[PDB]
Automatic annotation (TrEMBL), chain A:
Subcellular location per the Swiss-Prot or TrEMBL entry: Chromosome; Nucleus
Descriptive protein name: Transcription elongation factor Spt6
Cited function: Plays a role in maintenance of chromatin structure during RNA polymerase II transcription elongation thereby repressing transcription initiation from cryptic promoters. Mediates the reassembly of nucleosomes onto the promoters of at least a selected set of genes during repression; the nucleosome reassembly is essential for transcriptional repression.
Included range, full protein: 983 to 1138 of 1500
Family under the similarity heading: Belongs to the SPT6 family.
Automatic annotation (TrEMBL), chain B:
Similarity section: Belongs to the eukaryotic RPB4 RNA polymerase subunit family.
Annotated signal peptide: none
Nucleus found in the keyword field: yes
InterPro entries, per database record: HRDC-like_sf (IPR010997), RNA_pol_Rpb4/RPC9_core (IPR006590), Rpb4-like (IPR045222), Rpb4/RPC9 (IPR005574), Rpb4/RPC9_sf (IPR038324)
Name recorded for this polypeptide: RNA polymerase II subunit B32
Compartmental location: Nucleus
GO biological process, one term: transcription initiation at RNA polymerase II promoter
SMART domains assigned to the protein according to its UniProt record, in alphabetical order: RPOL4c
Ranges where the RNA polymerase Rpb4/RPC9 core domain occurs: 40-174
Superkingdom classification of source: Eukaryota
UniProtKB/TrEMBL annotation, chain C:
Keyword vocabulary terms for this entry: DNA-directed RNA polymerase, Nucleus, Transcription
Natural source organism: Komagataella phaffii (strain GS115 / ATCC 20864)
Entries under InterPro entries matching the protein: NA-bd_OB-fold (IPR012340), RNA_pol_Rpb7-like_N_sf (IPR036898), Rpb7-like (IPR045113), Rpb7-like_N (IPR005576), S1_domain (IPR003029)
Location of the protein in the cell: Nucleus
Family matches, as Pfam families: S1, SHS2_Rpb7-N
The protein, known as: DNA-directed RNA polymerase subunit
Any one of the GO BP annotations: transcription elongation by RNA polymerase II
Length: 156, 174, 171, 285
């Protein structure tokens, strides 16, 4: 019943869904249902439409990363880029950092993509910092995020 | 398969409302009518059987057959095993279990006294045999309860229902 | 309800059995073919009275087939439920759609729509049952039910009971 | 899926005390079921202290998630599996993952929480019945077996014990009319009859319960100065007006059956027999 109503609402609204946040903004569902189903439903990102930075279609929407951890994924991406100019609250800079990391305008000179540099980050340190700051056991979540950045929806 | 002694019943045009089976209305159909005929064609009354009478008759017939099959030389399981046919054995087992687990009167003399009371009574001289069987079977305790369970007795208010019920309860072995 | 009825049966005998023991053989054949059977017109035949002294008469030879046809008349005990009758029962199974009880050879199914609402079905109970605050009806429990409808089959009878009225339910 | 599971559950939001009791019962049920897994984990990973304590904490957290936050199993397994696994370091400080639970265990959690939500209504009904009894002295057996009551079979045993030993009180509370015959009417008559003092004199109920619970002799069953037949006949002769029995043998049989019923309705005997059968019983066909 819920899937039928959801697909009917999506069809009435338009041909496709723009981003995961619209499942809440467009009154398409409630809160707990969205939180449960958030990471298991995705929209295929396309670098052709990526040209505008204002693109509502988030790249993280094509990953297993939960929407509640999009900020954490952005922070990890900023950590891998080693760019200390961006602080922890400049979300537009984080979005541009992900844009560069996954779909750089200039292809890397070597064969190691910017997503590969995430392997140099120490997940244990970040997990300990998160557990100290907000009491969250998310080391497995950080591992999953790194895996998703290394390959979007690898077959399980 | 088996055919009743009542035959004919050819086509007509009238349709009657006393054709449908209904225990409350005491409409038992043609084959269970109040008047029956034996093999000689003489008048015969419908023969109802209470669980006590039915149990007595089935036990007597089964033990007679068991004695005859052994050359004229008690357990319900053995008695059921006497009969032939697996489905027949199961059916007689189920009937015996029902009768045993709901036998109000397991003694011949108690059943005889109950039948005498329910037949020779002046009030019971009009009672339908189905009503008599229901009264002796259900083991009702109250006039209101009996009337609710047996709607036919509601229209028969010339019956000493309460004292007859108390007599049955007395005759019932505690 | 149990009754005494005078029934008749048509019995056909093959010529290979035309011996001195013809009568007794006809008797056992009748007993095997009548005891325990279920006819919609009459109900269930449980026993045949005087099973060893039944008159069989003279058999008639069927022209063109040799076999003899016998007309056997006998008295038997017959049980048949009636619409609107209240009888005792024993519950045989409990299910969410309803519970199945047994009234002698007849198995009666009672749906939830004919059960009082307070007797909510409890599947967690061991064994699962339809229970209320003061009532609990499970497998093997005595129940007093009223037969509402009877369904006629080829050689079977299906009855429907109810416990929704007074003086019904658990006993 | 949760709505379908909870469709039959009329009352779902338990109290905090009931919530903690549900968590404890779920933990105990898992410990009983996964005893082999816990034993193997403890034996292999003997170096780590209180692995099972962390297991209990993780089970409590999972129950909290499922009940309060209404999280489906795959979401928990894909985004909360950090709670389900305990990362300990060995003597070499190598990070070792310990898979405390699997998805099948989460399904078991859902089934167990449904089961406890079902039995919670029954335990509340028994509590309400006991409160309606309003005993002048709180029955020690009632408290002792209600505190340790985990299965609905034990709740049924409690109900049977309470109804048997307070048949008159329970019947009055029902009265506080369909002529259903009380199966305990004969025992109530025995209680009202003059032979009930003899039944007392056979053995003290409180002393019997204390001796059985202790499993050793705390008091000696004092034998009355006169034989059972002597006392029965004497009371029958001196109380012909009230003794409803006809013969002394009939009163003797009634006393024996009443004592048998008293022994049968004792929760401790039933519990011991059930434990013995569940532990060392065999199956024959």
């Amino acid at each position: 019943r819920k899937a039928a109503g959801l697909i009917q609402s999506i069809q009435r609204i338009g041909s496709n869904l723009v981003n995961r946040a619209h499942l809440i903004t467009e009154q398409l569902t409630s809160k707990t249902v969205f939180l449960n189903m958030a990471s298991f439903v995705y929209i295929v990102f396309d670098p052709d439409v990526e040209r505008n930075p204002q693109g509502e279609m988030d790249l993280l929407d094509s990953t297993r990363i939960h929407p509640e951890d999009y900020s954490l994924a952005r922070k990890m991406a900023a950590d891998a880029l080693d760019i200390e100019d961006i602080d922890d609250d400049d979300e537009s800079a984080m979005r541009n950092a992900i844009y560069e990391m996954v779909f750089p305008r200039s292809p890397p000179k070597d064969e190691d993509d910017l997503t590969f540099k995430l392997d140099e980050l120490i997940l244990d340190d970040y997990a300990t910092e998160l557990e100290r700051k907000h009491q969250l056991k998310k080391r497995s979540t950080l591992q999953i995020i790194k895996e998703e950045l290394q390959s979007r929806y690898r077959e399980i | 398969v088996s055919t009743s002694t009542v035959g004919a019943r050819r086509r007509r045009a009238k349709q009657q409302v006393d054709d449908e089976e209904n225990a409350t209305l005491l409409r038992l159909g043609p084959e269970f009518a109040l008047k029956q005929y034996d093999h000689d064609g003489n008048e015969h009354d419908l023969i109802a059987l209470s669980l006590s009478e039915s149990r007595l008759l089935i036990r007597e017939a089964l033990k007679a057959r068991s004695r005859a099959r052994n050359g004229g030389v008690i357990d319900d399981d053995e008695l059921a095993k006497v009969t032939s046919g697996a489905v027949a054995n199961g059916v007689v087992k189920k009937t015996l279990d029902y009768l045993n687990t709901f036998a109000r009167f397991k003694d011949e003399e108690t059943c005889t006294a109950v039948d005498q009371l329910l037949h020779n009574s002046s009030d019971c001289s009009v009672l339908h045999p189905f009503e008599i069987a229901q009264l002796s079977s259900l083991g009702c305790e109250d006039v209101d309860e009996a009337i609710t369970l047996i709607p036919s007795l509601a229209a028969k208010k010339e019956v000493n229902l309460q004292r007859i019920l108390d007599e049955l309860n007395r005759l019932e072995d505690p | 309800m149990f009754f005494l009825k005078d029934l008749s049966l048509i019995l056909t005998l093959h010529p290979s059995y035309f011996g001195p023991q013809m009568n007794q053989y006809l008797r056992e054949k009748l007993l095997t073919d009548v005891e325990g059977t279920c006819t919609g017109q009459f109900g269930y035949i449980v026993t045949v009275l005087d099973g060893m002294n039944i008159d069989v008469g003279k058999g008639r030879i069927i022209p063109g087939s040799g076999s003899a046809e016998f007309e056997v008349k006998y008295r038997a005990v017959v049980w048949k439920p009636f619409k609107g009758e209240v009888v005792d029962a024993i519950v045989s199974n409990v299910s969410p759609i309803g519970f199945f009880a047994d009234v002698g050879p007849l198995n009666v199914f009672v749906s939830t729509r004919l059960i009082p609402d307070n007797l909510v079905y409890n599947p967690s109970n061991s064994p699962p049952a339809y229970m209320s605050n003061d009532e609990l009806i499970t497998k093997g429990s005595k129940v007093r039910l009223k037969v509402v409808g009877t369904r006629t089959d080829v050689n079977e009878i299906y009855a429907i009971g109810s416990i929704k009225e007074d003086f019904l339910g658990a006993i | 899926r949760f709505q379908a599971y909870r469709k039959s559950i009329k009352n779902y939001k338990l109290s905090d005390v009931d919530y903690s009791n549900e968590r404890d019962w779920i933990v105990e049920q898992l410990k009983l079921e996964k005893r082999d897994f816990l034993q193997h984990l403890t034996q292999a990973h003997s170096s780590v202290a209180h692995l099972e304590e962390k297991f209990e904490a993780s089970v409590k957290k999972i129950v909290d998630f499922i009940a309060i936050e209404s999280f489906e199993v795959p979401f928990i397994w894909n985004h909360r599996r950090d709670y389900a696994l305990h990362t300990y370091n060995d003597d070499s400080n190598n990070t070792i993952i310990v898979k405390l639970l699997n998805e099948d265990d989460l399904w078991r959690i859902v089934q167990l929480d449904l089961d406890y939500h079902s039995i919670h209504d029954k335990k509340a009904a028994l509590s309400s019945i006991y409160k309606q009894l309003d005993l002048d002295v709180v029955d020690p057996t009632y408290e002792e077996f209600f505190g340790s009551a985990r299965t609905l079979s034990e709740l049924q045993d409690i109900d049977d014990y309470l109804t048997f030993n307070y048949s008159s009180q329970v019947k009055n509370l029902t009265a506080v009319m369909k002529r259903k015959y009380s199966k305990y009417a004969i025992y109530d008559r025995i209680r009202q009859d003059a032979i009930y003092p003899v039944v007392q004199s056979i053995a003290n109920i409180s002393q019997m319960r204390e001796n059985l619970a202790q499993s050793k002799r705390l008091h000696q069953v004092e034998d009355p100065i006169e034989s059972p037949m002597d006392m029965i006949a004497d009371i029958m002769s001196t109380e012909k007006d009230k003794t409803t029995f006809i013969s002394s043998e009939k009163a003797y049989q009634a006393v024996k059956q009443f004592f048998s019923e008293q022994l049968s309705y004792e929760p401790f005997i039933r519990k011991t027999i059930r434990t013995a059968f569940q532990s060392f019983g065999v199956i024959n066909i």
